[PDB]
């Protein structure tokens, strides 16, 4: 059985947030903005090589969630 293993060379500036399943992607962005001052409008969340639309619920994605902000 296959298990894809992503190795992070260190994890500087990595941030972990406590989402509920009922949150959406836009919800995460808002949470990120509230904590870093990094504008929601400029955030692009990606998960395994695909960008995540604002309206996707987080619970629909799952279990530790990893999203890349590119």
């Amino acid at each position: 059985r296959w298990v894809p293993v992503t190795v992070l060379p260190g994890c500087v500036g990595c941030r972990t947030v406590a989402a509920l399943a009922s949150w959406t992607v836009r919800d995460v962005k808002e949470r990120i903005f509230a904590e870093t001052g990094f504008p929601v409008s400029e955030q692009r969340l990606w998960r395994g090589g695909r960008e995540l639309s604002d309206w996707i619920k987080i619970g629909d994605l799952t279990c530790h969630l990893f999203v890349n902000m590119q």
Side-chain angles (χ1 to χ4, degrees), residues 1-14 16-25 27-34 36-49 51-56 58-62 64-69:
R1 185 233 308 180
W2 288 24
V3 182
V5 174
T6 290
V7 176
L8 316 171
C11 209
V12 210
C14 280
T16 307
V17 323
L20 301 180
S22 68
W23 293 24
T24 68
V25 163
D27 290 321
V28 186
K29 296 190 179 177
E30 307 278 355
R31 173 52 84 120
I32 283 156
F33 169 72
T36 66
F38 193 98
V40 171
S41 62
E42 299 309 304
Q43 285 174 55
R44 300 300 182 271
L45 297 191
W46 294 70
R47 181 178 179 279
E51 174 165 356
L52 289 160
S53 307
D54 286 290
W55 59 82
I56 297 171
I58 295 314
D60 289 326
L61 308 167
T62 82
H64 202 328
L65 209 67
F66 282 82
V67 297
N68 181 19
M69 193 190 283

